[PDB]
């Protein structure tokens, strides 16, 4: 909702599919765009933890 921030590598501000929250900065990202699923124990976005995606 309004208080939740979507900031995925795709740059599309849309709530779609399985989404995952960065543990530190709290943005939401699409699991499919980031290559993860709900099985990971912890998650950081690509700005908090720079890496190829």
């Amino acid at each position: 909702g309004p208080l939740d921030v979507i900031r995925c590598i795709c740059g599309l501000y849309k709530d779609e599919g399985l989404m995952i929250q960065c543990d530190k900065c709290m943005v939401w990202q699409h699991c499919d765009c980031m290559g993860v699923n709900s099985d990971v124990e912890h998650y950081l976005c690509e700005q908090c933890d720079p890496r190829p995606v």
Partner: peptide, 12 residues
């Protein structure tokens, strides 16, 4: 980790 799926398909 915290996840969500707002419009998830249900079998029900």
């Amino acid at each position: 980790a915290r996840t969500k799926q707002t419009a998830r398909k249900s079998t029900g």
